[PDB]
Structure 1
Amino acid sequence: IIIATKNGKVRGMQLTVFGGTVTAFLGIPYAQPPLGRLRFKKPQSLTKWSDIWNATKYANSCCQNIDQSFPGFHGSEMWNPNTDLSEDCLYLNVWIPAPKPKNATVLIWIYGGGFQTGTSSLHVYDGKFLARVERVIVVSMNYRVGALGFLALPGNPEAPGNMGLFDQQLALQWVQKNIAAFGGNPKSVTLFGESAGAASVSLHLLSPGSHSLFTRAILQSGSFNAPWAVTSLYEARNRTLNLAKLTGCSRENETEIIKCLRNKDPQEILLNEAFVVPYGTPLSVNFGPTVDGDFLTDMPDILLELGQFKKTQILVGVNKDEGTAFLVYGAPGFSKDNNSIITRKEFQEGLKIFFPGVSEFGKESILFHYTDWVDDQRPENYREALGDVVGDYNFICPALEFTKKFSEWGNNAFFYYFEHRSSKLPWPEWMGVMHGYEIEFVFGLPLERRDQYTKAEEILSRSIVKRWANFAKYGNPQETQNQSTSWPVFKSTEQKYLTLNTESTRIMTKLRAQQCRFWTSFFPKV
């Protein structure tokens, strides 16, 4: 029931899972609360406590703006924080198998949400199934988001940037110093995350300070080379200064600006974050990763291209309809409550939404490459094209390009294409296999029979869970016992990938070849 850590004792709680037992430690602090004069600073080491810390409920989520477009709708609200927002939010969770394992592989989850939102306490991130079923240890942490986690005055340690990434780093550090006491093997740590969490994972592969803190990496629908993932030094300052003007904190001394932003209430910072950009969408990564010179020593496209990253195996993948979720947050003619048949004029209006600072020719080039129809009279043509545009540009092609470049330096890489639409999916059918809806299969929620997933979904999650765990444990995402399709390595010549679905698991090649030649070779020029 009680584990002694380097900083003090913590008490867990027993959970009944599938006729077995999992020990959860929910809400272990891993840093000094980044409060007062610590706001905007890198996270500070925690002083010991003398009592027994009670880790029996999730801690506070970090301060963040909430998705409000669909009040009462489970499809959006399942992603909103489900614990109190507070700046006092630097906590982590541990699920260990019962009985206490001897030398168990550790899985460390990093949530996404644009670097502006998200929390480790969400139901779909519940690591008790992985601990029960595969006897791995699951760790997840809260990390600062938005301006409070990523506001940047580069060089200035009062606000250097990438704080939330250093939050993540300090938690991986905690697992190294402490996870052996829980029965974990610190020499066998696999990072996994989704969306901005997957982008985070890839930045840890790049950051020298994280290289000794994990073994392997899993990137679900995200990588640092995605266009939303890294803010420029120009942008980051313009955004910091714009936040300052918006809060009356403009000063000539940059340090005085920070001190001024320290005396504002969390809510005034949050209210003004959306408006630091003029191209202002609910899907703006207003404050995100930057080249700080500490976490990130150089522009990550350069480090990737020239082989400057941790050499290890990666598991990378994407969902079939990455882009559809984002169309109901602004694109004209779209609704989750109808089939969103849009016209040519509405499609073009959508490109202006999602490509705000792009030339007319750039937008026409997108229209040209995506509107050469197999049948021009099919009314869903423009609706599905805009979805593919947003998903190929923002997720599928950056992940493929990341996998190609990473594997060219000699490491094994495995790529998947997830094409199963959850039977319990509350969004309409036109949105397909949505961004974020593999997560529940990965965490094994379909393994609970009471949760009214189908039998085929239980088997798909069970196979996925096995492959994730075999990858974490052995660097090889096979399922070796149930005459499963063998998952080949992804090589930049042949570019083989594995499809994930309830019917047949297939090996295909060159996912989205035509679309990604456009996005990776032509569009960066425009």
Structure 2
Amino acid sequence: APTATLANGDTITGLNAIINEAFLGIPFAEPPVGNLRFKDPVPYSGSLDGQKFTSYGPSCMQQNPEGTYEENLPKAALDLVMQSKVFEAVSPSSEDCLTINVVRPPGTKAGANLPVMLWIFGGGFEVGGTSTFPPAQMITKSIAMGKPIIHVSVNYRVSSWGFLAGDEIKAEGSANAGLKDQRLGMQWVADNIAAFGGDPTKVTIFGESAGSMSVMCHILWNDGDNTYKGKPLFRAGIMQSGAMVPSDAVDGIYGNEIFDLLASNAGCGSASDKLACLRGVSSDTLEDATNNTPGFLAYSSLRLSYLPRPDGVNITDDMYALVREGKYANIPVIIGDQNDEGTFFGTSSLNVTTDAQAREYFKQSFVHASDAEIDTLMTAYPGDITQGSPFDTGILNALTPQFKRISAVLGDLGFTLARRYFLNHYTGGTKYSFLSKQLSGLPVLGTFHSNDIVFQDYLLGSGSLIYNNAFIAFATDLDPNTAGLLVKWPEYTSSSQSGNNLMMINALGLYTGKDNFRTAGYDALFSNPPSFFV
């Protein structure tokens, strides 16, 4: 029933879901299989003429979150679940996974010129797919608001398949393949979105967690040049939890170790060209070898095995430096956080209970940090359980004497204070920032990492006012205030500015506040950012 005519003249059919029209599973690239593994995506050249696109394709290969070279119960358990026929039926994954999904309000026709919201999912750069992020809530609210938008989502390679690094990967020019998948999807939207009723000049990119750090990377891509065929690929960005990635170069120390580990795992330790050896192994051996490297929930936690790393080609340098040096695209941005970003990651080191163990955990995580810097950090984030995350809970959530401590640190470096650093240095366009405390009181996790996905795609709550409405007004008008909320969202100029600069959210609704908390942690972490890179 729904129909579109692509740039190359092909004409496809979608599905009419009543409350919206969807075109799911459109291939935007050749399958990154065989000798195309770990390499840049190749544009799709073939025919889609007369084809039906009524369901999401398989996600790219997934990594066991509890994977690691060690053997243990959670690793065993998740593997048991992940390799099950039931799981593989309900959630199919494949190396041939580079597809794109377009969903629009019902009745939309070519030429409508609706603003476009291109979603980039977050899954710790190791798991994830588009099928788990329902656009219906967004789309519907946009219609109700009288600001209809088109929701676009793109699959990208994760874990070893999309973020392998090391000397060989650098030499070949194959770094950050997963980010390149994302970049091609954008180019595809530029060329084809008009056929669906969207305006290619009104694209707002947005993601959460890894999707968010992805949006930052796109702003920094090619020293800030975001054009394609002479026109910008997007006019704005919304980052939900995540700014710059605190990572060393692709041919760095941990990028090289992981590469080597993965190679030994696949049986390529003796190969003179391990990379070629890796392209030759079956998908099973590769999937297996990857699950034997640390997953995000493993003890390594935030020190991810796979993630965006400066390559000196498309991301020319340390991401913090690029921001200080003004090498970014000049676009208006909304960037916010959840009050308790680190409680999730803090669950991965619950066998650390004494300050002596805490100091060593940090030392193993941040190899570039001197004992002096470790000491300063452990002074800014003290053992006092009342001072940690879940913030403001007193002596509760004391799973261990160090849990709340470790959570306060990880969530700040990885997201919360990382954001403030971007904000204090960024002059590309108007900035807007928010902080959620919607789930205050939730035992153990607090207003935890990713709860925004729930209030943006699944359930309604005070938070949906920002996650849907405000995000919609911004994509349409480049100002979240056009949404018509009762609380005006003030512009963010600096964390040292007088007056409220953050939009806040609690169980009841919205209010304004200041971005001046944990200043001591900020200087401990960012006085010399590279001391804390992974």
TM-score bracket for the superposition, by shorter chain length: 0.7 to 0.9
Aligned match for 2:459, one of 443, 446, 465: 446
- Which position in structure 2 is the counterpart of 1:468? 471
Deviation at 1:523, TM superposition (A): 7.2
| Correspondent of 2:266 among 247, 251, 255 | 247
> How far is the alpha carbon of 1:126 from its aligned partner?
0.8
Shift in alpha-carbon separation, 1:160–1:172, aligned structure 2, 3 A: same
Q: Distance in 2 between matches of 1:30 and 1:22?
A: 22
> 1:45-94: per-residue Cα shift (whole Å, max 9, x none)?
1113154232111111101213354969xxx9xxx995311100001111
Q: Does 1:507 align with 2:513?
A: yes
Scaled by the length of structure 1, the TM-score of the pair is: 0.83
Taking a change above 3 Å as real, the CA distance of residues 267 and 485 of structure 1, as seen in their structure-2 partners, is: same
Counterpart of 1:368? 379
Is 1:169 equivalent to 2:177 in the alignment? no
Residue 116 (structure 2) aligns with: 106
Residue 400 of structure 1 pairs with residue 410 of structure 2: no
3-state secondary structure, aligned to 1:302: helix
Corresponding letter in the other structure for 1:64: Q
Aligned to 2:290: 273
Partner of 2:209: 195
Q: Does 1:131 align with 2:136?
A: no
Does residue 413 (structure 1) correspond to residue 431 (structure 2)? The answer is yes
Query: Residue 366 and residue 139 in structure 1: after superposition, are their counterparts in 2 closer, same or farther (change >3 A)?
Result: same
Aligned partners of 2:141, 2:408: CA distance in 1, in Å? 36
Q: Which residue of 2 aligns with 1:185?
A: 199
Counterpart of 1:147 in structure 2 is 160
What fraction of aligned residue pairs are identical, expressed as a percent? 28
SS of residue matched to 1:95: strand
For 1:61 and 1:215, locate their aligned partners in 2 and report how far apart those are by CA, in whole Å: 28
Change (3 A) 1:397 1:509: closer
If asked which structure has higher relative contact order (CA below 8 Å, sep 6+), I would say 2
Q: What is the CA–CA distance in structure 1 between the aligned matches of 2:453 and 2:386, rounded to whole Å?
A: 34
Structure 1: unaligned runs, 5 residues or longer:
334-341, 448-456
Tell me: CA distance 1:261–1:524, structure 2 relative to 1, closer, same or farther (3 Å): closer
- The question of whether the paired residues in 2 share the 8 Å contact of 1:229 and 1:289 is answered with no
Comparing 288-297 with 213-222, which one deviates more in the overlay?
A: 288-297
State how many pairs are aligned.
485
- Inter-CA distance 402–365: structure 2 relative to 1 (3 Å threshold): same
Structure 2 equivalent of residue 452 of structure 1: none
Residue in 2 that maps onto 1:521: 527
- For residues 276-303 of structure 1, what are the alpha-carbon distances to aligned partners after superposition, in whole Å with 9 as ceiling and x for unaligned? 6799636542132233343223333332
CA distance in 2, matches of 1:38, 1:422: 47
Which residue does 1:432 correspond to in 2?
446
The answer to whether 1:217 aligns with 2:237 is yes
The one-character-per-residue Cα deviations of 1:90-146 (angstroms, maximum 9, x if unpaired) are 011111111206111111111112212211111xx1112212221211111110111
**1:187-246 Cα distance to aligned partner (Å, 9 max, x none):** 00011011111111111101136442111111111122x425865534333432332233
What SS does the corresponding residue of 1:121 show, helix, strand or coil? helix
CA–CA distance in 1 between the matches of 2:61 and 2:471? 31
Q: Distance in 1 between matches of 2:252 and 2:114?
A: 41
RMSD: 3.2
TM-score (normalizing by structure 2): 0.82
Which whole-Å CA distance do the structure 1 matches of 2:185 and 2:309 have between them?
A: 20
Contact preservation (8 Å) 2:320, 2:529:
no
Deviations 1:340-394 (A, max 9, x none): xx66567557646755775555444333222274979946374422221221122
Partner of 2:281: 264
Are 1:118 and 2:128 matched, yes or no?
A: yes
The letter for the 1-side match of 2:506 is: N
SS in 1 for 2:480: coil
CA distance in 2, matches of 1:150, 1:172: 19
Which one-letter code corresponds to 1:500 in the other structure? I
SS at match of 1:366: helix
The change in CA–CA distance for 1:231 and 1:41 in structure 2 (over 3 A counts) is: closer
Query: Deviation string for 1:147-180 (max 9, x for gaps)?
Result: 21122324544x6111111100000011000001
For the structure 1 residues 103 and 386, does the alpha-carbon distance in structure 2 shift closer, same or farther, using more than 3 Å as the test? same
Give the superposition deviation at 1:6.
2.6
Q: Provide the rounded CA distance (Å) in 2 between the counterparts of 1:215 and 1:229.
A: 29
> What is the aligned partner in structure 1 of residue 490 from structure 2?
487
Residue 17 (structure 2) pairs with residue 24 (structure 1):
no
Post-superposition offset of 1:263: 1.3
Equivalent residue of 2:51, what SS?
strand
2:93 alignment counterpart: 85
